[PDB]
Design a protein around this nucleic acid. Structure first.
Ligand SMILES: [Zn+2]
Lengths: 199, 69, 94, 103, 137, 34, 52, 142
RNA sequence: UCGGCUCAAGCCGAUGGAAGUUUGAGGCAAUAACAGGUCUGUGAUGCCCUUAGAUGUUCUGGGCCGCACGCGCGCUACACUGACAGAGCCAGCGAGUACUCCCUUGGCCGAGAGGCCCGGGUAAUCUUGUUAAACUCUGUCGUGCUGGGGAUAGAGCAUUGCAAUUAUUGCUCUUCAACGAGGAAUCCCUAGUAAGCGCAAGUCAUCAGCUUGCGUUGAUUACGUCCCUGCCCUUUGUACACACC
């Protein structure tokens, strides 16, 4: 009886974060594989990895830690991912209870849709824009998506009686399809539109 | 900019009308959709729980979440 | 302040006040005493005299009233003249 | 010839000089077939002082940190009374020594 | 239906939809915790709002306020002494604070004390630097 | 003195608030004899 | 007549000074040195103090 | 199997023991209650009316788990930070008389004894056995 | 050690390994200059000046803090990723008493600040496991400048000190200002780093919003370029060489 009696069913099953097995992940598109890593799972994102030491060592990392790190910002939330890991796991339950689908399915398909493909870079034109509408790499896609996603949740929940958990929850489910009521997708769509102009 | 601290008849029968049809219930949703105070929401939460119409998922000092029975 | 002992300077000035009060003739105001010290609490026993307290440059004399028992004598002679001010100089331009 | 279980302590600024003194002292004693409990070495204490370099204050502000270190390395022994005077001879310079009978 | 969302004690309205202990804090001269002490000793349900109450409990509430020392409250917890050379204690309330505030000014004014001069002119009385501090307003 | 200062109603905080308030041809250092 | 420097001087600053300057500013009190911080680094090697 | 105090949830033990101790109903109250600030750093009295009894469990438990304890050490264990306003915060310890007299009363009811040997107070055999019983009950109820 | 570039010096990437950016961080540091700073560190020092109504030394009181207003380094906040009430509970660097009064445990009195009586330690032995803060669990409050915020002031109680008024600081009760993420501008920073949070030492009888050090939690983005702002090397021009002052 060294281990808690209640949490015993998992042992006869493949490794998972109790409530959700990572098995049977989406089949929707390509070009973001090799850059989202789930093939080696983890229970909790609180792993003290040395991803920063090299260029692409942070490319081999479960997406679950990425979300937790991105959520903590703005001075007060510096190094306190415990709340962050709390919210993400709890928010998973909300969307699972609000929709029969797997919450990892909710997070993955949203982030693969909310990334731009072309953008614009400010080369010197003596005060004007020679903006050639350059392309974007798949790695930067997820980097900007996660960053802008988490910012959308906090700004919405700010100065409101709603809390971030369900606010973040609503953000993911609206981004599943073209709801247009999501911070991410609204700003995402304009980016190509201004880029398409200077094409 | 005030939420009625006391529950009236009009809110009561609306409550027992729809709360068996919601998918999720929270403190926020009650204060938002039903124009009720947060204090009464926690009071309503505990009373409707014991009568057995919503099921608890997790309990904690900050957020309580319940679904259908 | 009174629980601790009182040194030569308090006793010295009190005997000056005592001498003035005894030699004063009724229907007249007692003579004036000038001092530099400014750290004596006001005592009801010390009523009926006129004291010229030093204000850092000059001696200022004030008649003592009874209801001020809970202050010092220094608190009754200002050190600095109030600032009327003037016209801004060649500064404050950057 | 009643033993008293003495203890002898040493102090110095150097490290290598003191340390070789400690080994030779233990072997000089041991040659006459006396029992000895080994070299209990006390911890080294480090003390620092930081001060400003400039004497006036213009320019950037820069500090420097001087240091000094101290060692103890005391020794104990079980022996009769006056053999200590013959044995504690031939010490170095600067090195201080204090003897505690610990009776 | 006894929900009366307005109350009137000592010439000032107070709200009723808030909690009982915090409503008394609205009155000048009493704080959030001083209210707690006296509202605890009157044996009133602290868990309910200030609107669902009635007159009789209110009577004991206000009664404590005027004479504190008679109802087993210490002296150091109070906020008034030495109104004169031979003085007594007190517990000043909404309009007595302004009245006793004024009084102090002409007392110090007529005595011609340094503090009065600062109050007269209107500068900082307690010693603090002013040459760059809060001079705009 | 101190008593007189109280009577000396000349200029106060409100009075102070009420009261209201070249080309050189030389180069960077050439100016003056500095 | 000998009351000119009567006032006690065993309390606070001014009752102590550097062994070489009698300069009462920035004086060191750690470890019982009582020497100016300025004069220090000129006799530091003699006292025995080496930087690292 | 056999259990002891160290085999139960912390916050459960204090709540479980608080309920039992009040049902027995034998300990002095010096009247300090209703007028205490809980410490020089805190602002309002605790909310729960029965806070004073609850506290009893917490202090009894640690004296079992420590070699020796005294009145002064509880001050600095129970303290916390104080919002001095716009200046930065520090660490300040709790009230001394409150902790002193409460454990005076506690030891009069045969739970611990004085230690003039070295200082402080250690728990006594009967007191040690008492805590185990309440802890044991929790295990099966779980 | 390997696998692809490559004449080579090397660079990158995988494996092994505690460690593969010079393994991480510092100390010292060339030829030669500046009318850079310091005469207020020195019984280091030239000249000038003052010297007994002293610019020598000493005692009393004050001021350097006085305020319509412009500028710089910092501290607290604008809240729910929060405030408030209980409880669970984890460090490191350092410091400490002789002619003086240091670090202080324990017992007793005291709402609180404080007070009295034995005692330990000149120290890996006693203070000290420095039970620090942040943090974690259970509740109250609930979008309202409200229980977020703590400027301004009144009353009272103590401590340091010869002396607290222009409040030293602390404690007790009341009073409840501006401030909803801040224009034109502009700073610091590449991994146990920024940032958050506290602790020790320095000055010190008391006073830290300051500096020098210590630990806890712990990330987004890059492995680059000369577009802006600095600097050095080459080519070039000179009627300058005290050298564009
Ligand atoms: Zn010197």
């Amino acid at each position: 009886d060294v281990l808690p009696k209640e949490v015993l069913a998992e042992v006869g099953s493949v490794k998972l974060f109790n409530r959700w097995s990572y098995d049977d992940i989406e089949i929707r598109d390509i070009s973001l594989t090799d850059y989202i890593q789930i093939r080696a799972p983890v229970y909790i994102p609180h792993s003290a990895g040395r991803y920063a030491v090299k260029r692409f060592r942070k490319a081999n990392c479960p997406i679950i830690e990425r979300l937790t790190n991105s959520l903590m910002m703005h001075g007060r939330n510096n190094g306190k991912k415990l709340m962050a890991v709390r919210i993400v796991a709890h928010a998973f339950e909300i969307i699972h209870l609000m929709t029969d689908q797997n919450p990892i399915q909710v997070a993955v398909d949203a982030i693969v849709n909310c990334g731009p493909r072309e953008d614009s870079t400010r080369i010197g034109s003596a005060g004007t824009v020679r903006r050639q509408a350059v392309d974007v790499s798949p790695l930067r896609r997820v980097n900007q998506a996660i960053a802008l996603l988490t910012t959308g949740a906090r700004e919405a929940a700010f100065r409101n009686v709603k809390t971030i958990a369900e606010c973040l929850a609503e953000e993911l489910i609206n981004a599943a399809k073209g709801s247009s009521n999501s911070y991410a997708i609204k700003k995402k769509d304009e980016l190509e539109r201004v880029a398409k102009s200077n094409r | 900019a005030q939420h009625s601290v006391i529950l009236d008849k009009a809110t009561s029968d609306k409550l027992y009308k729809d709360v068996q049809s919601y998918r999720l219930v929270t403190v926020a949703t009650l204060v938002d959709r039903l124009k009720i105070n947060g204090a009464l929401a926690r009071k309503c939460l505990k009373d409707l729980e014991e009568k057995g119409l919503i099921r608890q998922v997790v309990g904690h000092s900050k957020m309580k979440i319940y679904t259908r029975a | 302040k009174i629980n601790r002992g009182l040194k030569r300077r308090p006793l010295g000035l009190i005997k000056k006040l005592r001498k003035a009060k005894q030699e004063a003739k009724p229907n007249e105001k007692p003579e004036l005493v000038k001092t530099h010290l400014r750290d004596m609490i006001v005592v009801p026993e010390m009523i009926g005299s006129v004291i010229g307290i030093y204000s850092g440059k000059e001696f200022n004399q004030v008649e003592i009233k009874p209801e001020m028992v809970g202050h010092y004598l220094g608190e009754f002679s200002i050190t600095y003249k109030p600032v009327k001010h003037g016209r801004p100089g060649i500064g404050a331009t950057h | 010839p009643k033993v008293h279980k003495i203890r002898i302590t040493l102090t110095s600024r150097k490290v290598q000089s003191l340390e070789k003194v400690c080994q030779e002292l233990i072997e000089r004693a041991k040659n006459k077939d006396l029992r000895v409990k080994g070299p209990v070495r006390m911890p080294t204490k480090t003390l620092k002082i930081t001060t400003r370099k400039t004497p006036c204050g213009e320019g950037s502000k820069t500090w420097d940190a001087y240091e000094m270190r101290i060692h103890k390395r005391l020794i104990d022994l079980t022996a009769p009374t006056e053999i200590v005077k013959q044995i504690i001879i031939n010490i170095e310079a600067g090195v201080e020594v204090e003897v505690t009978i610990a009776a | 239906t006894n929900f009366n969302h307005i109350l009137r004690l000592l010439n000032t309205n107070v709200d009723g939809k808030q909690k009982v202990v915090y409503a008394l804090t609205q009155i000048k001269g009493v704080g959030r915790r001083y209210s707690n002490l006296v509202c605890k000793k009157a044996d009133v349900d602290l868990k309910k709002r200030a609107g669902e109450l009635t007159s009789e409990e209110l009577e004991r509430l206000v009664t404590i306020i005027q004479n504190p020392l008679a109802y087993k409250i210490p002296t150091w917890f109070l906020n008034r002494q030495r109104d004169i050379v031979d003085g007594k204690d007190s517990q000043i309330l909404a309009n007595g604070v302004d009245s006793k505030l004024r009084e102090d000014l002409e007392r110090l004014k007529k005595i011609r004390a340094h503090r009065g001069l600062r109050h007269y002119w209107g500068l900082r009385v307690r010693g603090q630097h002013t040459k760059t501090t809060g001079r705009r307003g | 003195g101190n008593e007189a200062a109280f009577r000396d109603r000349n200029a106060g905080r409100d009075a102070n608030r009420g009261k209201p308030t070249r080309r050189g041809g030389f180069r960077g250092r050439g100016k003056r004899e500095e | 007549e000998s009351v000119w420097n009567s006032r006690p001087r065993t309390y606070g600053k001014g009752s102590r000074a550097c062994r070489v300057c009698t300069h009462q500013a920035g004086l060191i009190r750690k470890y019982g040195l009582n020497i100016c911080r300025q004069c220090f680094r000129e006799k530091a090697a003699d006292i025995g103090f080496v930087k690292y | 199997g056999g259990v002891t105090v160290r085999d139960v949830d912390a916050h459960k033990f204090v709540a479980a023991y608080a309920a039992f101790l009040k049902r027995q109903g034998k300990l002095p109250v010096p009247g300090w209650v209703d007028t205490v600030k809980t410490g020089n750093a805190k602002e309002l009295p605790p909310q729960d009316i029965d806070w004073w009894y609850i506290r009893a469990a917490s202090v009894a438990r640690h004296v079992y788990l420590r070699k020796t304890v005294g009145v002064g050490r509880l001050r600095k264990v129970h303290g916390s930070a104080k919002n001095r306003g716009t200046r930065p915060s520090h660490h300040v310890d709790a009230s001394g008389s409150v902790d002193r007299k409460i454990m005076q009363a506690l030891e009069k009811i045969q739970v611990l004894e004085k230690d003039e040997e070295r200082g402080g107070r250690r728990i006594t055999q009967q007191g040690q056995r008492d805590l185990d019983r309440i802890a044991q009950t929790v295990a099966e109820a779980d």
